[PDB]
Write a protein that binds this ligand. Structure first.
Ligand SMILES: Nc1ncnc2c1ncn2[C@@H]1O[C@H](CO)[C@@H](O)[C@H]1O
Ligand SMILES: Nc1ncnc2c1ncn2[C@@H]1O[C@H](CO)[C@@H](O)[C@H]1O
Ligand SMILES: N[C@@H](CCCC[NH3+])C(=O)O
Ligand SMILES: N[C@@H](CCCC[NH3+])C(=O)O
Ligand code: NA
Lengths: 502, 499
C-alpha cells in the first residue's frame, strides 16, 4: 500500500537515471480506441495487417504473461477496450530489451503501444505490438471496480477514481450534457437570447434563500453571491430583449442533503407577454419533450431507495395535476385558515396547527414561513407524479403578480416531482408601488431574523418605474432534473465534485 | 423630472380608482411586430383590411397628436417599429371616451392596440386602431437617444434606446455558440466544476473569501477551474471543456472585471504545439464567420477616433519569452532565472528602463514585468508569447529542449492577454515542489500565490495522461470581435465604482 507507492517512485527514479523514457511530452496516436474498434472490430479471427503500423494509447486495465515471450495487455480509453499482444519476436530493440521494457509497466499506468492491427485467433480485437512506452505511471494499487474502494465517499472525494472505474458514473455526466443541450436548443428555436448576469452583487435577491457574503478589497464593498439571477433578468425585459434565458450557478448558504448542494445549476427564462398559464403549458411541453427524448416514453423508472430497492414509475403524461396551495392545506387541516393570511390571528392559528400536527415550527414565525411548513406537510407530499402547486399567497411571493381572481394569492406555481421542487414560476409583478411594499415587508422579516428574506433593491424598483411589460418568468433546478432523468436519489451523483461534510 | 414621476403615480391612482385598466395581467398579441411587418409590409399604399382585427403591442417611441381627432403613435418591439393611427371615428367607446383613453398614454409606455392592418397613404406600415390599453407605464421622461455611466448603471436604458448595445449582446451569444459547436464537433464533453472550494488555485490572483455557516468552513471563490478539470482527465473523460465565471479580487480597468467569463479545455494526448494550431483555427474561423475577413477594424480610442487593423491571418507570430526580453535589454538575464543574482539583476533592469517594480520582488513577478514592457507591447496582431520560465509557470510541463523553460504560450492581441495554455505538468514530484515554492511565496507576502493543493497532488499520483490545456478570456474576445475598448461594453451589468 504505502510500500507500493514508495517503490513506484523508486522505479521511476531508476528509469530516469537509466536514461529511459521518463514522462514523454508527446505521444502521437494514430486513432482513438473507438475509431480502432470501428475500423478493425469485424475482421476475421487471426487477421493481422503487417503493412500498417499504428500507435494507440490508454490506461492499462489488465496484464498477463502466458510465457517469457508473450504478454497480453488490455488498455481502455474513451469507453473502448483493446487487447495488446506483445510477442518478443516483434519487439523493436531500439526501444530497449523486451523484458526491461515490459518490467516497467503496471496495471493502472497510462501507456502507448505501436504495432499491427487485427484480431487474435481467439477473436479478440488486438494490436500486435512492437514497442511500449510508459507515458504516466499510476503510483497506487487500484481496485478493479468501485466496490473495491475504501468508502463509497471515495467516489465523491476522488471523483477521478469513480470515473476511471465506473461506466455508470461517466454515463450520468454525458446525460447531463445531453439534457442541457436539448434545453438550449428548445429555447434557441423559440428565438430566446442567452445572457449572463452577475454572480457577485452589492444586493442579493430573487429567492427565499440565505446568501454567501464576500468582500471586494479595492472597491471597499461587501458583495453577495447571487441566490438567483431574477432581478437582473427582468431588467433585460424592461430593456426590450423580449425573450432571455440564463443557465448557471446559484449559491445558497444552507444545509446539504440529498437534494441540496450549496452551489447548483439552475436556469431562468423571462418571456414578455406570457402569464403563468402560458408558463405551465411550456413547462409541460419542455419537460415531457426532454423525458421523451431520453427515455422513449413519458413513464420512466425511479429507484427512490437506491438501486438495491423497489422500482416505481413516474408518469410525465400531460396535462399535470394542479393543487391549489391554500385549499389543499385547508383540506389537510379540515378547517380554513384565518384571513387575512398574514394577520396575527392567522399566524397564531398556524402555529397551533403546526403543533397539533407535529410540524416543526420555522423561525422566525412569519406567516410566509408558517404557510411554507404547512404546504410541505400537507401538499408537497401529494406530488408523486409531476404536479403543479399553484396560487401561492402574496405574503410568501414578494415578486409574483397578484392573482387576477383570488384575493391574497399570486399567479405563481411550483412544479414538484416525487415531493421535491423542480420549478418555480410566475406572472411577474410589474407594479412598482406594490413591489416596494413587498420589499419592505421582506426587509422587516430579514431584520426579525429570517435569514432567507431579502433586502429592498432600489435599483430594481427604479427599473420597474421604466416599465416592465406584462411578463412571465420561470426557473428550473437542473441538477434535480438530472436526478430524475438519470434515476439517482442523491444529488452528489449528478455533480462532479459535490460538497462534502468535514 | 421629480414632478413628472409623482404626477404619473397620481395618474395611475386615478386610473385605478376609476376602475379603468390598471396593469392588465395578460395581453394576447395576434402576432409579433416583425411578423406584422413581414405580412403587410408589401401591401399597396393606403391599403386597409377592415375585415381583419389584430392586437399588437410594444413600447411607445413617439406620439404625435396632429389634431383633436387623430393621433399617430410609433411602437417598437423585437427590433420592429410599427405606426399606429388612432382616429376618433374608429374608437371603441366601450373602452372610454377617445380623449380619456389617449390622455393616459405617454412616450415610453408599454401599450397594446387593437385595430385594422394596412399602410398609410404616405406608405407607412400602420395599424388603424380601435382601442388602446396601457399595459405598463414609464414614470420617467426618457431621452431620445443615449452621464454615459448611465448606460452601465441602468443597462435597461441602454438596451431600450441604443440598437448598437443590443447588437453587442447578440454577437456575444453568437460567438459563444460558435465556440461550443467547434468543441462539440471534436467530441468534447462540457462539464461544470465548483466555484466554491476550501482552497484556490490554477492562476495567479487574489481570491474572494466567503463562509459556509452550516459547515462552519471558510471558502474561496475559484480563480480558475484548472485543477478540477485535470482530475477529469485522470478520470478518463479525455476531452472536456468548461465555460463560466472566474472570480478575482483585484482592481477593475478597461480589460478587468472582478467576475469574468472564461473557457478552459483539456485534451488528452495534445501538447502546446497542438494547442497553438487549434487556437489559430478556432479564432481565425470565428473572426471570418463574424467579419467575412481576417483583417478587422479596431478603435482603441472610440468610434470617432483612429481606426487600426488587426490581422488574424495564419500562421501567427511567435515570440520566445526570454529571448525577446533579452533582445529588448540588449543583454542576457542571469541563470538560474530564479537565483537571487537574477532577481537583483532584474530589479536593476526595471529601474534602468523605468519599469514599476512588483511586490514582492519574486523572480516570477519581475519576469512578468519585463515581459509586459518588452514583449507584450509588440503583440498588435494576435501573437504567441511562448516558452515561459518554470518559475512563473508552476503547472506547466518542463520544456523538452530548453532548460528552465516550460511548454507554455500566451496569446496576446493589441497588447492584451487572450489565451494562456500549456503542455500540462503530469509529474507529481515536480508538481509538489512548485506548489511548495508557491506556498513559500504566499508566506513571503505574494497575495497572488496559491497554497499547496494536496488533493491535486494525489490525483496526479493516479496518472494524468500527457495532456494539453488551454484558457480563453471570453469577454476580451468579444471586445475585439465587437470593436469595444472597454470591457464594460461587453458585460451586461459590469462592476462600477461604488461612488
Ligand atoms: N441547494 C439546492 N441545490 C440544488 N437544487 C436546488 C437547491 N435549492 C433549490 N434548488 C432547485 O433550483 C431551483 C432554484 O434555482 C429550485 O426551483 C429547485 O428546483
Ligand atoms: N479580471 C479579468 N477580467 C476579464 N478577463 C480577464 C481577467 N483576468 C484575466 N482575464 C482573461 O481570462 C483568462 C483567464 O481566465 C485570461 O487568459 C484573460 O484572457
Ligand atoms: N428566482 C426564482 C425562479 C424564477 C421565478 C419566476 N420569476 C427561484 O430562484 O426559484
Ligand atoms: N488556468 C489558466 C488557463 C489554463 C492554462 C492551461 N492549463 C488561467 O487561468 O490562465
Ligand atoms: Na399530453
Amino acid at each position: 500500500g504505502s510500500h507500493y507507492t514508495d517503490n513506484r517512485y523508486k522505479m521511476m527514479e531508476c528509469i530516469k537515471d537509466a536514461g529511459r523514457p521518463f514522462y514523454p511530452h508527446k505521444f502521437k496516436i494514430s486513432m482513438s480506441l473507438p475509431a480502432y474498434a470501428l475500423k478493425y472490430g469485424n475482421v476475421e479471427n487471426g487477421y493481422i495487417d503487417k503493412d500498417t503500423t499504428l500507435s494507440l494509447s490508454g490506461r492499462v486495465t489488465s496484464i498477463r504473461s502466458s510465457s517469457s515471450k508473450l504478454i497480453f495487455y488490455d488498455i481502455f480509453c474513451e469507453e473502448q477496450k483493446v487487447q495488446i499482444i506483445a510477442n518478443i519476436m516483434e519487439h523493436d530493440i531500439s526501444t530497449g530489451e523486451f523484458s526491461v521494457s515490459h518490467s516497467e509497466i503496471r496495471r493502472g499506468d497510462v501507456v502507448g503501444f505501436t504495432g499491427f492491427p487485427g484480431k487474435s485467433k481467439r477473436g479478440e480485437l488486438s494490436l500486435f505490438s512492437k514497442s511500449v512506452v510508459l507515458l504516466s505511471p499510476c503510483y497506487h494499487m487500484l481496485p478493479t471496480a468501485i466496490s473495491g474502494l475504501k468508502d463509497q465517499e471515495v467516489r465523491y472525494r476522488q471523483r477521478y477514481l469513480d470515473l476511471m472505474l465506473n461506466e455508470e458514473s461517466r454515463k450520468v455526466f454525458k446525460l447531463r450534457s445531453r439534457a442541457i443541450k436539448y434545453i438550449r436548443n428548445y429555447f434557441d428555436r423559440l428565438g430566446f437570447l442567452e445572457v449572463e448576469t452577475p454572480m457577485l452583487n452589492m444586493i442579493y435577491g430573487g429567492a427565499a434563500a440565505r446568501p454567501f457574503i464576500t468582500y471586494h478589497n479595492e472597491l471597499e464593498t461587501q458583495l453577495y453571491m447571487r441566490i438567483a439571477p431574477e432581478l437582473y433578468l427582468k431588467q433585460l425585459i424592461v430593456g426590450g430583449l423580449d425573450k432571455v434565458y440564463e443557465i448557471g450557478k446559484n449559491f445558497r448558504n444552507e444545509g446539504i442533503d440529498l437534494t441540496h448542494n450549496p452551489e447548483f445549476t439552475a436556469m431562468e427564462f423571462y418571456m414578455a407577454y406570457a402569464d403563468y398559464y402560458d408558463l405551465m403549458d411550456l413547462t409541460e411541453e419542455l419537460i415531457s419533450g426532454l423525458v421523451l427524448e431520453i427515455h422513449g416514453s413519458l413513464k420512466i423508472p425511479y429507484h427512490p431507495d437506491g438501486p438495491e430497492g423497489k422500482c416505481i414509475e413516474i408518469d410525465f403524461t400531460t396535462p399535470w395535476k394542479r393543487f391549489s396551495f391554500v385549499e389543499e392545506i385547508e383540506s389537510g387541516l379540515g378547517e380554513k385558515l384565518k384571513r387575512p393570511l398574514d394577520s396575527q390571528e392567522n399566524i397564531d392559528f398556524m402555529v397551533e396547527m403546526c403543533e397539533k400536527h407535529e410540524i416543526e415550527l420555522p423561525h422566525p414565525r412569519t406567516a410566509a414561513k408558517l404557510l411554507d411548513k404547512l404546504a410541505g406537510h400537507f401538499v408537497e407530499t401529494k406530488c408523486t407524479n409531476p404536479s403543479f402547486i399553484i396560487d401561492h399567497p402574496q405574503t410568501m411571493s414578494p415578486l409574483a403578480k397578484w392573482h387576477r381572481e383570488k384575493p391574497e394569492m399570486t399567479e405563481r406555481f411550483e412544479l414538484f416531482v416525487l415531493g421535491k421542487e423542480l420549478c418555480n414560476a410566475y406572472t411577474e409583478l410589474n407594479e412598482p408601488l406594490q413591489q416596494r411594499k413587498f420589499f419592505e415587508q421582506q426587509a422587516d422579516a430579514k431584520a426579525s431574523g429570517d435569514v432567507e428574506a431579502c433586502p429592498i433593491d432600489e435599483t430594481f424598483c427604479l427599473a420597474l418605474e421604466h416599465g416592465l411589460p406584462p411578463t412571465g418568468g420561470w426557473g428550473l433546478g437542473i441538477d434535480r432534473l438530472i436526478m430524475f432523468l438519470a434515476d439517482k436519489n442523491n444529488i452528489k451523483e449528478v455533480i462532479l465534485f459535490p460538497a462534502m461534510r468535514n
